[PDB]
Design an enzyme around this catalytic site. Structure first.
Site, PDB file in Angstrom:
ATOM      1  CG  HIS B  41       0.630   1.699   4.156  1.00 47.81           C
ATOM      2  ND1 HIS B  41      -0.262   1.928   3.128  1.00 47.81           N
ATOM      3  CD2 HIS B  41       0.248   0.513   4.714  1.00 47.81           C
ATOM      4  CE1 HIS B  41      -1.175   0.961   3.096  1.00 47.81           C
ATOM      5  NE2 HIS B  41      -0.901   0.091   4.056  1.00 47.81           N
ATOM      6  N   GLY B 143      -6.666  -1.611  -2.011  1.00 47.71           N
ATOM      7  CA  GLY B 143      -7.633  -0.656  -1.500  1.00 47.71           C
ATOM      8  C   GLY B 143      -8.252  -1.043  -0.176  1.00 47.71           C
ATOM      9  CB  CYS B 145      -4.678  -0.545   3.390  1.00 44.84           C
ATOM     10  SG  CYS B 145      -3.569  -1.665   2.547  1.00 44.84           S
TER      11      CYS B 145
HETATM   12  C1  LIG Z   1      -3.868  -1.349   0.831  1.00 42.09           C
HETATM   13  O1  LIG Z   1      -4.898  -1.020   0.344  1.00 42.09           O
HETATM   14  N1  LIG Z   1      -2.752  -1.833   0.027  1.00 42.09           N
HETATM   15  C2  LIG Z   1      -1.495  -2.194   0.684  1.00 42.09           C
HETATM   16  C3  LIG Z   1      -0.307  -1.589  -0.074  1.00 42.09           C
HETATM   17  C4  LIG Z   1       0.839  -1.061   0.805  1.00 42.09           C
HETATM   18  C5  LIG Z   1       1.639  -2.133   1.534  1.00 42.09           C
HETATM   19  C6  LIG Z   1       3.001  -1.647   2.028  1.00 42.09           C
HETATM   20  C7  LIG Z   1       3.193  -1.827   3.533  1.00 42.09           C
END
Ligand SMILES: *C(=O)NCCCCCC
Ligand SMILES: *C(=O)NCCCCCC
Lengths: 306, 306
Positions: B41, B143, B145
């Site tokens: 993503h 952040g 992820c």
């Molecule tokens: C990560 O840092 N944030 C998650 C935002 C995206 C989620 C959509 C699948």
């Protein structure tokens, strides 16, 4: 979202851990620049530990009595000295992995990460906050002496704790990295025991703010209280007094959540008087006091979730 | 003595964390040999996230659309591909800090350490056990992820989790390192929500053995129970069924403490029926289910303290 007992990433400290052997005793040491720091009780036999005079025991040692192993490399000991309850072993090689570091002494109610180690090898990392009675509730097995506690501030490791021993209640006692014990404890065999402990009130209030930031709001109320009336209930439940400096410190969390510190105090009073009635806060059925206001701000930089 | 929610030392994983930027999105990646793994993503705009076709979005990118930063060094992207929900960015430099590693998928009820990271920089480490409903109760801010979950087995890092998103209850969902989600979740914006969860019974029994090894014995009783009668009470309290394999797995802890698994089951039944009556176990007022039998054995290798 979420709230966890989170430790600092331990790599910078892992790169400093070594094994120190003297006689038949092995424990851990901390290798910074060309010095290895470890508990001086590494030089004691059990009979010695009964009532040691460490200046005597140390004058009978030489450098070659100390085997230092850094991973698969033996480090050559070229000097030794005592500073309070820590031994300083000068070695002929500066640790190439030395981080920026400081030796800081912490206060009761402050938190730190512990890197539990055995035979110079790190085994686990956890968060531990110094108790008002200067013990820590750690998780340590025989061989863990010399494991260290620390905070990391940007890329700088502030070492604050070296582990020395377990008291009879199962709690842990140690020194700062200057070898000065936290609390009224000594590195010899006595009947020494932890004194009475208290709950760290400012931390409990911080954790309630964390709960609000994370959507637990059931314990809030419309009431307020005065600082003196709050501290009158605190005393009764073995909580430390709350000071105006504590209120100031809780300022930012109060502002983020829009709940005045003295209003949160009224919630805490109600929780102390009534219990929880089968409910939980941030996954706990007890009031948690091992998160400082700074820990909450660092971990909850996230949305307040009105 | 003592019992803490302990994570694995994180250094080996810290040395693999990098920052991946595509467009205006920055998140974390995992740099192993000459590949960087991250959530696919990263290639989505918010409008994209509403309903993306990732094969379409990816065919419109080129290598130069991906900025990878490893500390202070930009890594040159020389290939890109998708594997399920992870992106694989081939880079022109193998990570010199790559540990021995494996990509393992864990089971519900198993635990792992999480290294929470922001902008490729590690911020904290904590222990998290996959819930029966395939979510984790983590601590993650925007952040994070790309942060990973892992176990360390000797010097080998078994990566098991990459963080992708937060569900509306505040719990967390992600994939194995093959990009396959844990649970029935998707990397796009839907009304998706955590299904009903249950308590991990074998872990609760393991933790009661930990408590006994650490001197908490107040909940023990003379009673026993049969496996079927136990599971009949479990069902009523939203606990998973206990199997004969679970009993076998608890064997060593039963032997160390001399408490039969089915006797400990009778204690648990009583705790479920009566509560704790204001007492605590290992510092908790709730029954804890995020320690596996292996976690207890590893941390409690210490004396049983008869
Ligand atoms: C990560 O840092 N944030 C998650 C935002 C995206 C989620 C959509 C699948
Ligand atoms: C450390 O590994 N064990 C502690 C045993 C010595 C305590 C006496 C001060």
């Amino acid at each position: 979202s979420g709230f966890r007992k989170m430790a600092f990433p331990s790599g910078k400290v892992e790169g400093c851990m070594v094994q120190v052997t003297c006689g038949t005793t092995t424990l851990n040491g901390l290798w910074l620049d060309d010095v290895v720091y470890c508990p001086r009780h590494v030089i004691c036999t059990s009979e010695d530990m009964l009532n040691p005079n460490y200046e005597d025991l140390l004058i009978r040692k030489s450098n070659h009595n100390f085997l230092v192993q850094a991973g698969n490399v033996q480090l050559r000991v070229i000097g030794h000295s005592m500073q309070n309850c820590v031994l300083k072993l000068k070695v002929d090689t500066a640790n190439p992995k030395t981080p920026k570091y400081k030796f800081v002494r912490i206060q009761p109610g402050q938190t730190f990460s512990v890197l539990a180690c055995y035979n110079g090898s790190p085994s686990g990392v956890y968060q531990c906050a110094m108790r008002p009675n200067f013990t820590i509730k750690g998780s340590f097995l025989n061989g863990s002496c010399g494991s260290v506690g620390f905070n990391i501030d940007y890329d700088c490791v502030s070492f604050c704790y070296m582990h020395h021993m377990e008291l009879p209640t199962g709690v842990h006692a140690g020194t700062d990295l200057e070898g000065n014990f936290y609390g009224p404890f000594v590195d010899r065999q006595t009947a020494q025991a932890a004194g009475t402990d208290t709950t760290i009130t400012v931390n409990v209030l911080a954790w309630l703010y964390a709960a609000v930031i994370n959507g637990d709001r059931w314990f809030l109320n419309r009431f307020t209280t005065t600082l003196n009336d709050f501290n009158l209930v605190a005393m009764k439940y073995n909580y430390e007094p709350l000071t105006q400096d504590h209120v100031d410190i809780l300022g930012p969390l109060s502002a983020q959540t829009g709940i005045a510190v003295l209003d949160m105090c009224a919630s805490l009073k109600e929780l102390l008087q009534n219990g929880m009635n089968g409910r939980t806060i941030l996954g706990s059925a007890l009031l948690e006091d091992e998160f400082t206001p700074f820990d909450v701000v660092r971990q909850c930089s996230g949305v307040t979730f009105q």
